[PDB]
Amino acid sequence: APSLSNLFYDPTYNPGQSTINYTSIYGNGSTITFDELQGLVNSTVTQAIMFGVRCGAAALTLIVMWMTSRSRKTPIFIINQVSLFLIILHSALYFKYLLSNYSSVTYALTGFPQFISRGDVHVYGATNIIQVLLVASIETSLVFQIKVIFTGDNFKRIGLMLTSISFTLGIATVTMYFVSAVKGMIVTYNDVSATQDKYFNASTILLASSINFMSFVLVVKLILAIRSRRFLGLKQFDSFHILLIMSCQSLLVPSIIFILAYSLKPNQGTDVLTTVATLLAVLSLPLSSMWATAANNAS
Template structure:
């Protein structure tokens, strides 16, 4: 044996069914095996995160919220993501991944169930894309519900156009992939279509999230002008919206620089996880009591109502056990407060027990 012989670069001879001989380099076999291991680790991590978040979403969502469209869309997106990831993982345990079948291009021993599994994965991915885009359109419309009708219609038209383009590319890619799968052909001819689909998906996500966080950022700024500086649900959704905008865009660009198996699938999974996670986090923040010293907590309020009307509320309103059955709404002062505390408050109108309305300035003069 020659001293310069490298066994890790030698060729391995295979015999085809027809009796022909063909050689495969050992390095190609190693790369093929490493590709399967790396991509299964990637899919497995996404699958575990999606299942855990789906269980958490079911446990932490209040019963009255489970009929909302956002909750249903988030659950469907997680289930579709789990389904397509399971199908992707099952592919790497099917006869498609046999070394001889791959290098010889002989898939005659692959059963019909393996073809059905691969086709089902493309269908789940398309349904997942539709769920995500629909959820983004719906949430943007809810957040911008206080716009004028003309602007809301313009925004809805643009949103539908932006959401339809990636869905169209995804459906075209699904059809092309299914044709290649049933013909057991490589998918190299769909590389351009995959790149276009990935670019349009990233663009749509950035577009919706930019509108989303811009509206919430403006609302947070208005709240700060009113003196509301607590860490509330609006800031939670603002932070998660920034995450949904930045991280998928970063991963989408990164896949053109680094060679990582199925890196583009992480973009969709991160968006699928971020949407329900922001709702869970905001709900937990909303349910926390304002007074942590032991007093009774404030009533739970609807998240979307909080987003729409909290700019006009003063969070300095205190809760009292004596008025828990029939609460009072106070803008600046309350007759149940001590005189010294009333004197330190600004002038304004006070409403008590939903019955009497009196002027704080007048009451202060009388006292």
């Protein structure tokens, strides 16, 4: 401590509007303010909290489902039980990504391609392959729940066609995710500082569409379970409607978060919303799968 400056005695001095000087690819003359630097740092600090919550939740959901189940060997159980595992693997390679040189303040401010090695591109590839192997599990789970809802003593007209639109939506979502992934990889392998992003913002809309369709079909099943019982002389539900509708026996909360995630402009946390809604969908599949295979009028 040789000597303090005079600005130490200024009550109204504002650090954050001060100047930072650095050398970039455009020479030794780039400048930035401390608040744009802090805005770059606060978005990494905000995207690590979410994925740590995801890893925690999914690990403690996997164990609890292993310990609290009566009827194992069911396909729906196995698919629900590997989706929670691909969530944890996706979150692991993203923590690997978040501490690497592709997410550094060095690359961000100074766009030098010498800072990117081979090994940073292979974890990007691997993460883009686990993201599509997770969407495929979600879609196959939804198509088995739909295939178990209406098949049976119910009318075969509606039931046979709703599995068709759900198989169609699932295969289209998976194919579009695969296309997006394989082109992004080509682009990145050609140039490290290149971005290809027109196919990620329609894959999310089709995942959202398929979840909204599952919510519609479960609401349909509930209205027909309140309509069939009154025709006969059997007693109705006392306070089961509130549990089914409100708690996520039907996928209404993830569906609302999805419809507010892409309708709203990006400046209102649109990236914080899809990440919460994918977690809530994968966490709500065990609860949507108990109502789906339940006696409509036998009980």
